[model samples]
Target: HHHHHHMVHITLDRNTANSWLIISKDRRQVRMGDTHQNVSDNKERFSNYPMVLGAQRFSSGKMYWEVDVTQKEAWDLGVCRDSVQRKGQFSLSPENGFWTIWLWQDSYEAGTSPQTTLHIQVPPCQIGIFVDYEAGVVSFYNITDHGSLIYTFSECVFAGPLRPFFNVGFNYSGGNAAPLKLCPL
Candidate 1:
């Protein structure tokens, strides 16, 4: 029941963010910005990864989106491959083009390839991302549970155009500055 797919309206792509990540001028939302925002050196920014990217780019069929990580402790939702690596050091998995799923101290990972450990019994505050792009899958949904099934990434070899991924993690001292939202329709 992935809502029959096709609900994507993701926005947050302030030139591929990461100037400390704080995009929300109606680009839905994003957070973790206490500094760094002179924004210039581009090539699709994201200098060292506080991450952001979703200005709609799919490439084939079914798509979906939803994300509002409640009190947001750490983030890193899903989908990538619009030429992955935004600058330096990449490793979210799917060999590198990332198919994400994350959370930090409360631990719930699944950026697979030696990173699966997810035991979510009910720790999702609205999250759902479906994709099919010619059936190479990429599931993940637990809109607080009724939409269960929190991980899927099957076959996936999408060799271009994908986008819609985000990370806003690490602002720990303020206990994760909370703001990931994108859920509208």
Candidate 2:
């Protein structure tokens, strides 16, 4: 777990960001766009999910990244298959190519089958995500307590490359206004 400190850094891919997602110029920070932009709808752009993917894809390796969700009350972070559906309404579950953890209504939820709800005593401000593609495992951590375990998804089948997924949730009356930053180490 502590070894995650040496993993390679990843940045958000603006091209893959949804039309309603605002990405910082540096591409390291993303926040739900308060106003939708008149952007071209690329085939890979997420139309329904207010999310974004990383620029690089991993096939097999131990990769890790941290997300700053301190100000965000609703957000999701994890990994998604490179071939995951990007258009229309779909279930955000591992079986549907998304293995993610989200926070909303003062609680955390894992996007697994039958979705797991967690009422954490302390909401995680900095969320750490670690992925082992070949081993078929994805783990989430609460960085507030020196990287305490939050959740782990095991036996995750990956048919192809896996990419980091991110979302700031819905944008309503500045509810999800905070930026979801990818920390640099």
Per-prediction TM-score to the true structure, in the order listed? 0.33, 0.95
Candidate 1, residues 24-101: lDDT per residue as tens digits? 789998888888878787888878868888888888988888888998777888999898778887788998888989
lDDT of each: 0.85, 0.85
| Sequence-dependent TM-score of model 1 | 0.33
Which 10-residue window of candidate 1 scores lowest in summed lDDT?
1-10
Could you tell me the lDDT of residue 60 within candidate 2?
80
Model 2 off-target regions past 4 Å? Answer: none
**Lowest-scoring 10 consecutive residues by lDDT in candidate 2?**
1-10
Candidate 2 vs. truth: CA RMSD?
1.3
> After superposition, which runs of candidate 1 have C-alpha atoms over 4 Å from their true positions?
1-17, 22-31, 37-40, 46-50, 53-68, 72-76, 84-123, 126-135, 143-157, 161-164, 167-176, 179-185
What is the TM-score of candidate 2? 0.95
Top candidate on TM-score is 2
